[PDB]
Amino acid sequence: KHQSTLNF
Amino acid sequence: KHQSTLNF
Amino acid sequence: ALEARLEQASILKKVVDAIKDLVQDCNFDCNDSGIALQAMDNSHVALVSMMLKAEGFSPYRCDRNIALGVNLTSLTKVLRAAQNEDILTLKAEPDVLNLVFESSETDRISEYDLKLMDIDQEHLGIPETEYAATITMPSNEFKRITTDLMAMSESVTIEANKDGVKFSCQGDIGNGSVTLRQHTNVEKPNESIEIELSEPVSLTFSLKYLVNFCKASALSNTVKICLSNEVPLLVEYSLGGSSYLRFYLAPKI
Amino acid sequence: ALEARLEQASILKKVVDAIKDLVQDCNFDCNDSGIALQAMDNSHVALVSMMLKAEGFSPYRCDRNIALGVNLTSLTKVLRAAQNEDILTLKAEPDVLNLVFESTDRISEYDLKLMDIDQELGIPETEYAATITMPSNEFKRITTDLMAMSESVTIEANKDGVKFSCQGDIGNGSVTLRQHTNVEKPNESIEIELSEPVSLTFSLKYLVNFCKASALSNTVKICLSNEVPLLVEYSLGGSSYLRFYLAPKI
Amino acid sequence: ALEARLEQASILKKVVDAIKDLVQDCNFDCNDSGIALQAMDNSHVALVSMMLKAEGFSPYRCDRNIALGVNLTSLTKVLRAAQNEDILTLKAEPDVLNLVFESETDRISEYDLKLMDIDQEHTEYAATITMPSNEFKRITTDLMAMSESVTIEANGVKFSCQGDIGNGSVTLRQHTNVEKPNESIEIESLTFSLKYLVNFCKASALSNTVKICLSNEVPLLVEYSLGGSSYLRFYLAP
Ligand code: NA
Ligand code: NA
Ligand code: NA
Ligand code: NA
Ligand code: NA
Ligand code: NA
Ligand code: NA
Ligand code: NA
């Protein structure tokens, strides 16, 4: 539904 | 010379 | 209602590419004879008449007469996702046209459900017409001539007699003409210029429309241009069997 | 500090061409292992991770660890002046990156002004739920085609195959690829390693951008996990690579 | 006055395509030696000098010296309607230039181009470099990405520039290619606009080699030599 940010 | 419309 | 398999998607991609700049919305009419399209441009100057006969599919199944109301930009966006050599299946019950594209190479399957629209058919019946002149010529020759003359004029006059056909124009920069003599090419029959004429005939047409019709050049190696003082110009791209793509164009007067 | 010779400029031209629309400014990190790049796009949605290993050069000499802070538009303008089959030498002491392009006896020499760029990141070694190996051009065709009709693609993997699907104003689209081994043309294979079925959604704008790397590698590895970002890997000769990481839509 | 037949339209299409971005209006000068063009760009920085010698036609007939005042955009629109391998005939009495294009087939294209009245405004170099046309195109196009100006140094030859992103040079050593003579660099310091040089390089398709002639006293000559003693020449102020 919506754009997550980068999460390592 | 003006553009006529289709006539069948 | 409809289950129609083409051995190659190519045909449907070229037809839509050839038609989509003349006509935005239109109905594909499906019956036991196959799939027809009859659509006028917004100006009522040009009429597109297509028939893909049932024989051209493998197989063709129509259980019920249906219209598929399609936006040709939407349909183009879907047909772009088909390779020329993909096996294409059309299926409908309809709110949606189901398209399946199967690779000729891998086991890859593309599946599209295209939202259809209600579109009121503007169909008019075209009489069987005895034209004054018909010119058969290579499609690419007709594309070359219309594109070239459009650089220097909005209009082309088409003159036919026993000897040949002349396309001529005039513009701000001066005059242009292209003359083709009747000739039979024995080795390359599609390169022939064949002229059947009951009487000499001359009419004037918009090059913008003719150039548009020439986007169908890849469908057929030859094109039939049919002329009469009484009736609109027929530009016909004849296909395998009795299938065809036909463009009718009102003349300038 | 640096003296690095590539037998063919081609590789460096393709890498920069593949990355320059995602990332404007970035550091090339030079050490004894070779040349690395790790840069996020402005949105922090996408991460580019490149390594040209020392083995890929002939020779590679690093006397001192250095960062080359480069504008990729500037670098592109310079790399355009290299023929694919030119011998490319990188040299640096640095305020300037020296590039030499050798044909004939023709020599091109560029001194590119560098900028100070503050380096950002550790990526964990990840056991993905599914990996799909497929031809690069197949992935380019699919992402480009679906982008015509949608901003988003769902990637579904199982033992049998992988499905890319989308929905938009005009309707629904999907492309399904079955696991298959091509004996004659191995790059045309669809190989699926999966510990469990997995489905995630991504921006097609980003995926299409990653597909500008299609000319670097005949195959592309797409790696999926509910826990971690998408890995799109273009494996190169030896253990060199171009990798794109993409945060999913949730 | 004029009846000039070229075996192939190609040559006239390439010449106009090569010239039309430098020069809009200009005169084709027809005499018994053949067809000449001498036109400055609007800035009077660059001069185009073309001669298609009579020998290049089959046949060439001039009965009266004439100027054909032509807009090159108009002429381009007409020449696009000629296939490379068409037989091209130019005919004039003149208010009009008659062009006939003959096919393979029996097809005949005929154009009458409206002419305009255009007032005609009618060196031992220090260095000449002969090099492949495409090499000169590659160098000028590449350096133009990063600079408005190129310095040309000769003794081999070095093209160098500097700009916002840094410095660039290309060095060519004198070398004879025995198998592929057009690939040779034959040699027997000034600064120029790359915008103009790149424009001249639109003539690359006319000739496999280009002659660059340099002198402290006189403008740069960039010459695309053609069959026999016909030529396309560009002159550029430094
Ligand atoms: Na209709
Ligand atoms: Na036909
Ligand atoms: Na037929
Ligand atoms: Na070292
Ligand atoms: Na590898
Ligand atoms: Na004479
Ligand atoms: Na020559
Ligand atoms: Na010569």
Author numbering:
A (entry chain K), B (entry chain J): 500 to 507
C (entry chain A): 1 to 93, 96 to 255
D (entry chain B): 1 to 93, 96 to 105, 108 to 124, 126 to 255
E (entry chain C): 1 to 93, 96 to 105, 107 to 125, 131 to 163, 166 to 198, 204 to 253
What does the paper say about this structure?
Here, we describe the identification of a PIP motif located towards the N terminus of the PolD4 subunit of Pol δ (equivalent to human p12) from the thermophilic filamentous fungus Chaetomium thermophilum and present the X‐ray crystal structure of the corresponding peptide bound to PCNA at 2.45 Å. Like human p12, the fungal PolD4 PIP motif displays non‐canonical binding to PCNA. However, the structures of the human p12 and fungal PolD4 PIP motif peptides are quite distinct, with the fungal PolD4 PIP motif lacking the 310 helical segment that characterises most previously identified PIP motifs. Instead, the fungal PolD4 PIP motif binds PCNA via conserved glutamine that inserts into the Q‐pocket on the surface of PCNA and with conserved leucine and phenylalanine sidechains forming a compact 2‐fork plug that inserts into the hydrophobic pocket on PCNA. Despite the unusual binding mode of the fungal PolD4, isothermal calorimetry (ITC) measurements show that its affinity for PCNA is similar to that of its human orthologue. These observations add to a growing body of information on how diverse proteins interact with PCNA and highlight how binding modes can vary significantly between orthologous PCNA partner proteins.
